[PDB]
């Protein structure tokens, strides 16, 4: 994973996201959703999803939430106050903690001012405390600003390492982007049916076609402008739409 003071930032993009494999995996110790309850994720579409990743203590997972305070949310990783995504977290004692202490997981414990939301700060300047210019030298009136979790496998829970992933769905002003997978029934050839083909809503009997649709078209229309053919996505095979039987 990545440190807590330099978290990562992956920009998930156009694709088919299935938050159900996440939501029901039962391996996550914490799955909170804020802008949007979890079950309705596989039914919405946004412009971008960002995923941030890092590693913290066990009992600092309560500062990864909108409107908190503490050494983590103050200056390591700050979440805006109208967050939209979800926060996922699971214990990882066996991977990240090693006998003798894993001193490779640091965090920042001194900063001039709390972070702006989603702001990041990897500098390593000596936190000048005393009015006396530090001059880049340690000693009194000057602290190094980074400390390290010394993780060890015989630590009580709440001191063992937890891995955290923060998904943040954003919606700029584009034309569209990633959304959840869609269902798919079957072709009941010869049965007045109520159909919806990615937007086209109608009624009628569906039948195998023999018309040759171009290499980019979707459906077909007739003179006087009524939909009379469609193309199925799952397969891409011409199909005619015959009105029902009335008289």
């Amino acid at each position, epitope marked *: 994973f990545a440190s807590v003071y330099a978290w990562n930032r992956k920009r998930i993009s156009n694709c088919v996201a299935d938050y159900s494999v996440l939501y029901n995996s039962a391996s996550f110790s914490t799955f909170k959703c804020y802008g949007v309850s979890p079950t309705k994720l596989n039914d919405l579409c946004f412009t971008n999803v960002y995923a941030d990743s890092f590693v913290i203590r066990g009992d600092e997972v309560r500062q990864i939430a909108p409107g908190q305070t503490g050494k983590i949310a103050d200056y390591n990783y700050k979440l805006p106050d109208d967050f939209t995504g979800c926060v996922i977290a699971w214990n990882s004692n066996n991977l990240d903690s090693k006998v003798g*202490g894993n001193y490779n997981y640091l965090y920042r414990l001194f900063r001039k001012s709390n972070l702006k939301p989603f702001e990041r700060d990897i500098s390593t300047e000596i936190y000048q*405390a005393g009015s006396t210019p530090c001059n880049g030298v340690e000693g009194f009136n000057c602290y190094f600003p980074l400390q390290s979790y010394g*993780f060890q496998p015989t630590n009580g829970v709440g001191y063992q390492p937890y891995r955290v992933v923060v998904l943040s769905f954003e919606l700029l002003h584009a034309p569209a982007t990633v959304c959840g997978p869609k269902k798919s029934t079957n072709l009941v050839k010869n049965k007045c049916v109520n159909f919806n083909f990615n937007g086209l809503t109608g009624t009628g009997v569906l039948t195998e076609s023999n018309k040759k649709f171009l290499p980019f078209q979707q459906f077909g229309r007739d003179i006087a402008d009524t939909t009379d053919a469609v193309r199925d996505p799952q397969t891409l095979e011409i199909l005619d739409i015959t009105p029902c039987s009335f008289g």
Partner: antibody
Amino acid sequence: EVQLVESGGGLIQPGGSLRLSCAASGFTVSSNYMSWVRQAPGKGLEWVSVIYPGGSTFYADSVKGRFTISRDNSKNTLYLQMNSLRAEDTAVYYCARETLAFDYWGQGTLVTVSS
Amino acid sequence: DIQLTQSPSFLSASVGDRVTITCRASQGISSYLAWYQQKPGKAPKLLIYAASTLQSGVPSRFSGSGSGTEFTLTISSLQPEDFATYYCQQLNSYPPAFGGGTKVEIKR
């Protein structure tokens, strides 16, 4: 180097109040973890409150609420305005500059008798 | 669950000797705490850092021994002038737990 001195202790009754001034004799109370440590006489210590270099409170368990900490950087003073003392705190108060551990913490008293 | 640290108090010794004080930790703590010297009627002074890296401005008589739990301090070659109590703490976590304190007597 740093010689923190404090003032403000005395005697009062319940529902009273009192401001304590951890006078930062010494430098840069603007950017240091500071805290209040309390002990009743004949007893072990106990922790009260804490300020962050950036502003946060996190009060203790029993003194949750009813108790306020602040700083003043231009005056180099920490301010502890309390009120409604259950008189059950009659104690000897310390203010210490947490520097990755603690140390550097003066002394100062108080009593909250009902007379 | 908070940690409750313990100590075998009320020590008694003579000068120039070895004495050893342990500090229980009734939960899995890591290895970051600290010892203090509390002379009577005064302010504490921390001796042992967040483990055993004794903080500066102290003599060569203290030897903090750290671990996962069951931390232990040891004074070797005593000197008549350490009449006070010794506490444990537990840095890192905000509300921290303190020890019980061990007074140490000096035989004559």
